[PDB]
Structures are given as structure tokens and as C-alpha cells.
């Protein structure tokens, strides 16, 4: 399925994912698209920061849902 | 500011809004774009259906945030 990741530069990234993908797996997909190491990524969905060892489905992130990326200070 | 409204047809509607806009005002803006009467719209943000008399800001809906439209 597709999900979207919006950045503070006003970009929208489209990712190809499965619901059982871990957040860590999603950060790897963002690294593929943007070159940002996973350790520099803060991913947020509906106001909550996401944990690397949990899945998309653990957070009820569904097809065509939008996450937010913030780089760590 | 801009917000987005995604539909079940896969469309993404861009709206121009202010944070103090009521949800009813937002439904009017969707009517402008799609012709859907406000009474036929269910608007959802982060899993919660939105009340007509409350504002975008009441729900913490920010610039470039995405809502979901489901028809009744």
C-alpha cells in the first residue's frame, strides 16, 4: 500500500509499505528516498512519535495515511 | 493556510483556510470544490469526527494537515 510522509521543506514523500512494516523499516524507506539516516529521523502520526519496534498497524496507520518527518536537533 | 482533504476516490482536495474557521465553514469550502452539500459530509481528523460548531484550531488541525471526507 502507499503512505505519505510530509516534511518541513513542504515535500510529500510517497512510500510503498505493508501494514506489518516496523517504524524502523519505514525510516529505511525514508533513507532510500531522502538519504537521511534513520537515527536522524523523528516520525510522527497524529501527534505521537512513533517507536522503531512497533508496526504501522500498531498505530492504525492505513492506506493513504500521512505521517510527519522532523529531523532531530 | 492550506489544508488537505482526502476522499475515498483517492482525490486530495486543497483548501485555503484560517485556523479559526469552523468545521461548517470547511464543509462549505468542500461544497465549493466538489459540489457536495455540507449535510452529506462526514469530516474526520486523526480518527475523530469533527463537530460543525468547533474550529480547526479546536482540533489542532495545522498548516498542511490532512482531513478525511466520507459521504453519508
Author numbering:
A (entry chain B): 1 to 73
B (entry chain A): 1 to 72
What does the paper say about this structure?
Post-translational modification of proteins with the small protein modifier ubiquitin (Ub) regulates many aspects of eukaryotic biology. Ubiquitin phosphorylation is emerging as an important regulatory layer in the ubiquitin system. This is exemplified by the phosphorylation of ubiquitin on Ser65 by the Parkinson's disease-associated kinase PINK1, which mediates the activation of the E3 ligase Parkin. We biochemically and structurally characterise semisynthetic phospho-Ser65-ubiquitin.
Ligation went to near completion after 2 h incubation at 25 °C (as determined by LC-MS) to yield ubiquitin with an Ala46Cys mutation (UbC46), or Ala46Cys and phosphoserine at position 65 (UbC46-pSer65). We employed a Parkin E3 ligase activity assay that monitors ubiquitylation of the substrate Miro1 as well as the formation of free polyubiquitin chains; this assay has previously been used to demonstrate activation of full- length Parkin E3 ligase activity upon addition of enzyme-derived Ub-pSer65.8a As expected, UbC46 did not lead to appreciable activation of Parkin; however, UbC46-pSer65 induced marked Parkin activation, as determined by polyubiquitin chain formation, ubiquitylation of Miro1 and Parkin autoubiquitylation. In our structure there are two symmetry-related Ub molecules in the asymmetric unit (RMSD 0.081 Å) in the P31 space group; this differs from the previously solved Ub-pSer65 structure. However, the two Ub molecules form a covalently linked oxidised homodimer (apparent from the contiguous electron density), linked by the two cysteines arising from the Ala46Cys mutation. Structural conservation between molecule 2 in our structure and the reported structure of phospho-ubiquitin was high (main chain RMSD 0.659 Å). The β-strand slippage that gives rise to a reported minor conformation species was not observed, thus indicating that our structure also represents the major conformation, despite having a different crystal form. The electron density for pSer65 was clearly visible, thus allowing unambiguous assignment of the pSer65 rotomer. In our structure, which is at a higher resolution, the γ-oxygen forms a more favourable H-bond with the amide nitrogen of Gln62 thereby forming an H-bond analogous to that in the wild-type ubiquitin structure. The orientation of the phosphate thus appears to be dictated by a solvent-mediated hydrogen-bond network involving Thr66. However, pSer65 does exist at a packing interface and is directed towards His68 of an adjacent Ub molecule.
